[PDB]
Amino acid sequence: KVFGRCELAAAMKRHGLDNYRGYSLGNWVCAAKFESNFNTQATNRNTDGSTDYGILQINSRWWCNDGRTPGSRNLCNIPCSALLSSDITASVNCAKKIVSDGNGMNAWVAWRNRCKGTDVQAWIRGCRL
Ligand SMILES: [Cl-]
Ligand SMILES: [Cl-]
Ligand SMILES: [Cl-]
Ligand SMILES: [Cl-]
Ligand code: NA
């Protein structure tokens, strides 16, 4: 599924991301825009051993199981396929695990390099959630 900006913002709000661990909603919408272009089936297979899955491009090295890499971990305790669903709930649950693990939204490269420090509130402009 390819989401629109406000459509995804609504779903993320429903799943409780607005202000989660200090990150107002626009942070999460901006991260998804640059990570996946809002596409739930985005998948990128990297030379560094990461396969990144779904709307938040979550990494198989640590967070989900796809079977391919026996030295990896599965800390969200999910198949990576769960991150490719049309509903965002597994992606949001695993994102929440990543951030609350003594960490932040620095876990998304595109957040650090495209969203941090910007007017992230504007990703919810015209959404009237
Ligand atoms: Cl957009
Ligand atoms: Cl907090
Ligand atoms: Cl990671
Ligand atoms: Cl694996
Ligand atoms: Na894994």
UniProtKB/Swiss-Prot annotation:
EC number of this enzyme: 3.2.1.17
Protein name, as recorded: Lysozyme C
Pfam families xrefs: Lys
One GO term describing the cellular component: extracellular space
Remarks, miscellaneous: Lysozyme C is capable of both hydrolysis and transglycosylation; it also shows a slight esterase activity. It acts rapidly on both peptide-substituted and unsubstituted peptidoglycan, and slowly on chitin oligosaccharides.
GO molecular function ontology, one term from the record: identical protein binding
Active site residues according to the UniProt entry: E35, D52
Main location: secreted
Protein function: Lysozymes have primarily a bacteriolytic function; those in tissues and body fluids are associated with the monocyte-macrophage system and enhance the activity of immunoagents. Has bacteriolytic activity against M.luteus.
Record keywords: Allergen, Antimicrobial, Bacteriolytic enzyme, Disulfide bond, Glycosidase, Hydrolase, Secreted, Signal
Tissue expression from the record: In the egg white and polymorphonuclear leukocytes.
Regions crossing the membrane: none
Binding residues for substrate: D101
Start and end residues of each C-type lysozyme domain: 1-129
UniProt-listed InterPro entries: Glyco_hydro_22, Glyco_hydro_22_CS, Glyco_hydro_22_lys, Lysozyme-like_dom_sf
Positions of disulphide bridges: C6-C127, C30-C115, C64-C80, C76-C94
Statement: the UniProt record of this protein carries the keyword Glycosyltransferase: no
Catalytic reaction(s) noted: Hydrolysis of (1->4)-beta-linkages between N-acetylmuramic acid and N-acetyl-D-glucosamine residues in a peptidoglycan and between N-acetyl-D-glucosamine residues in chitodextrins
UniProt-listed GO biological process terms: cell wall macromolecule catabolic process; defense response to bacterium; defense response to Gram-negative bacterium; defense response to Gram-positive bacterium; killing of cells of another organism
Stated family: Belongs to the glycosyl hydrolase 22 family.
Subcellular localization: Secreted
Subunit details: Monomer.
